Design a protein around this nucleic acid. Sequence first.
RNA 1: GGUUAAGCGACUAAGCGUACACGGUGGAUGCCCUGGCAGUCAGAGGCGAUGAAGGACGUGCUAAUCUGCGAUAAGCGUCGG
RNA 2: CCCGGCGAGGGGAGUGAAAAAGAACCUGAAACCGUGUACGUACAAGCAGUGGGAGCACGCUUAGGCGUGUGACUGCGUACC
RNA 3: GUGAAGAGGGAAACAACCCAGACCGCCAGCUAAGGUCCCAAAGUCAUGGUUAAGUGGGAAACGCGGAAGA
RNA 4: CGAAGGUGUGCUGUGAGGCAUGCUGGAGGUAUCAGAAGUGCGAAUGCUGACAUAAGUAACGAUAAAGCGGGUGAAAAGCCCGCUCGCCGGAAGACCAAGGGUUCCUGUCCAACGUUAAUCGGGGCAGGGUGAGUCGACCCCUAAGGCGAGGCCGAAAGGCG
RNA 5: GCCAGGCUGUCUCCACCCGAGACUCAGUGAAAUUGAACUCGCUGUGAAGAUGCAGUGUACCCGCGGCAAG
Lengths: 110, 117, 56, 120
Amino acid sequence: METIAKHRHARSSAQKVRLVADLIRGKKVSQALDILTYTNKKAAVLVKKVLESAIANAEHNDGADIDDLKVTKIFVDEGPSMKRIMPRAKGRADRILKRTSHITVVVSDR
Amino acid sequence: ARVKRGVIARARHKKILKQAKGYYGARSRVYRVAFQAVIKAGQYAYRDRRQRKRQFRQLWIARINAAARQNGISYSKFINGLKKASVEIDRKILADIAVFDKVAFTALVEKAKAALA
Amino acid sequence: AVQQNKPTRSKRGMRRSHDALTAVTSLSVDKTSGEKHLRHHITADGYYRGRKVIAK
Amino acid sequence: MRHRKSGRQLNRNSSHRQAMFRNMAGSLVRHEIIKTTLPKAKELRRVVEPLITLAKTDSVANRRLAFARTRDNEIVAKLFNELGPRFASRAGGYTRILKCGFRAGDNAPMAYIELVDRSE
RNA sequence: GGUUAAGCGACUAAGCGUACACGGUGGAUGCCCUGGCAGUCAGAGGCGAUGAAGGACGUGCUAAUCUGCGAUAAGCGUCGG
RNA sequence: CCCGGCGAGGGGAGUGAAAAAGAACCUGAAACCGUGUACGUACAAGCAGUGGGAGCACGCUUAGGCGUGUGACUGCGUACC
RNA sequence: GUGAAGAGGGAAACAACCCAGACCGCCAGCUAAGGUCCCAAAGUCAUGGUUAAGUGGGAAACGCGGAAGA
RNA sequence: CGAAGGUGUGCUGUGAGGCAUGCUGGAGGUAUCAGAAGUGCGAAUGCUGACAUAAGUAACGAUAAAGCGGGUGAAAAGCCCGCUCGCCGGAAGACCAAGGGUUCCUGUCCAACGUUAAUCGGGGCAGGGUGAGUCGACCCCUAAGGCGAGGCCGAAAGGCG
RNA sequence: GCCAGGCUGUCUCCACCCGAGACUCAGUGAAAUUGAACUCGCUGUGAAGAUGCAGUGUACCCGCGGCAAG
């Protein structure tokens, strides 16, 4: 079967997170975990936590064979944007959008 | 009374966009560009409705001329021979015969030369 | 010096194509501790070249 | 252009760099090991190893110069008394640097730099 | 079948475009009203120095708000449903 | 109950007609952002469409050269108010 | 007369030049102006000549020189 | 036994259009004939809500300057302790007037803020803290000035005193 | 406003060095402006400065540091 784990409203930008997410697409669990551990990115650690949660869900809810898992479908999208006001010269203001990333990882031994 | 035009606007936008498939992004997904794109494509199709006839006629003429030159006669001479012999084979038929039947076009050129001489 | 037309999403993608990172894919397993670490780097429990580092 | 030039900038003033090197060398001598950025440890080597080289020989002038450098008394006392005899039989290579990954705050390279022996 | 030589020749997509399935902020469209606008029939057409309209501060078993009330303070006394 | 940091967040079980109703909570559009599928694209120039057009994958036909997805090549084409 | 309010074909594009007033459709024929060496569809067709200069493919006044467009 | 709404497919008409149905929808829609529009949007430097654009570029807010070992913490360079270097030092020291009104301390925590990480903070929640005959206000007198019964003037308000 | 003496990189003529940006990495993260772009050079035309028209030549696709001639 397929086990899905997601992180919603993450404190990172979807564009930046995809840069590290694309690496662990179509790769085995052990190599993906090693790459995420040795990759120095906030998005890297976020996706590491997401994949760890996915693996734990597979081990608990589903039957067995942790080793034979794989990253079948990993995708990250943009979510709610927090609007903030930043002063500038001449008394003007700029609207800055702090972005959040919804990350989803689906694994399946089959 | 008050009337809300949201449904009508949505239906018209969908109708316009349905004909804008495969227009390289903005011209397919943007309603404003798609509408103008649809009109321009329709104008091009209207012009091509006759451009197709022109191109097919020219291609048939070229194929008939090629076959006539292979057989040893000019296209104009062959057409004149057919007309004076009262042969009214259409150019499309002549090209198709020249393509799928060599002996048929050999007979055509023989008859045209006989009529000319 | 300002843009005259909107850059396309295709242009955005082709410009960001070079922003992809690379995987180390060079994990080295220590002979003594038997754990993986980066090349020329210590392990989690301060091991390197079969030597017990302070590991603190 | 760095054409045959030595000494990484490590952006700072000249006096700031001198004070940084002196303080870090003193701390390294005191603790027998420190954890710092790899370029920082590499720049440390050049200024710290000569300290032990000079400490190899014990004399009033050498002790005064070793005090003038690093401006400390405990470091001088430890020198000529502990590291001196320890490295008397070794020429060069008093300090070794071992990389230990990156830093969470910075992601810059970091390494442990320490004496080869360290007296366990 | 092996060699030499000449001609032809797809299979690669770092990324991009097109069409389909699934998704993310999005709250538009549809449905509903303890909400407003406009008229009809009636009372009232004024409140108050025996202290008006409007406010500050307090009042629960209550830390904050709305509402009622004012040291008798989310109530009190008499008479009815 | 499990991963997660004692968290946020998520995956199971259960209530629930529905959790594709989980408090960011009826229906959930368009512009924008990705994944998987099929085609084209690293020697080719211009309102990026149109007619022809093979080729490339699937279903139908109980073969029938049919439709869908793309358009290598090619004639024409200097947006709208 | 055209455009303004007329599409289409020919001259390179071009509106004031030539033919020709688009109801729609057919992988039909003919023709007007313009062309028949290819690009790009058609005569490398004939008959009697002119040109030696690429004149054609830049222009008048004298006996090809005047005759020059960034 | 499945209506509006949203999204595809097929059929149909010369047209704006109409009918059948898969999918989410679980409660309304409305034939034919007639009447009124806040009756049909692609532009008016149009307004409101959301989103790409330049772009993951500038920038991260005086060149006084941080570093080392340990404690807490999953994460330590910005929290705490100890050591070293530097800056102001008629200031970047201390208290008051005006102003601000609990930002002051403790316990706890990362939902949002610090142009970054945060366990920290002038951030969220709960508790504590302000003790006056000698401080100042308050109170008595008072310049500039204001109010100003009687009074003068002015259509009324209202000006002067 | 002009002249006399020293003075100096204003200059002949610009060269090196010390710091902050400029360049890479880690984290946060805007604006001006934006009809649609598969956005080359030359000749002719063209509402009169042609990336887009007719003729011709060149050019594998896409990033990064600068010049601004448009």
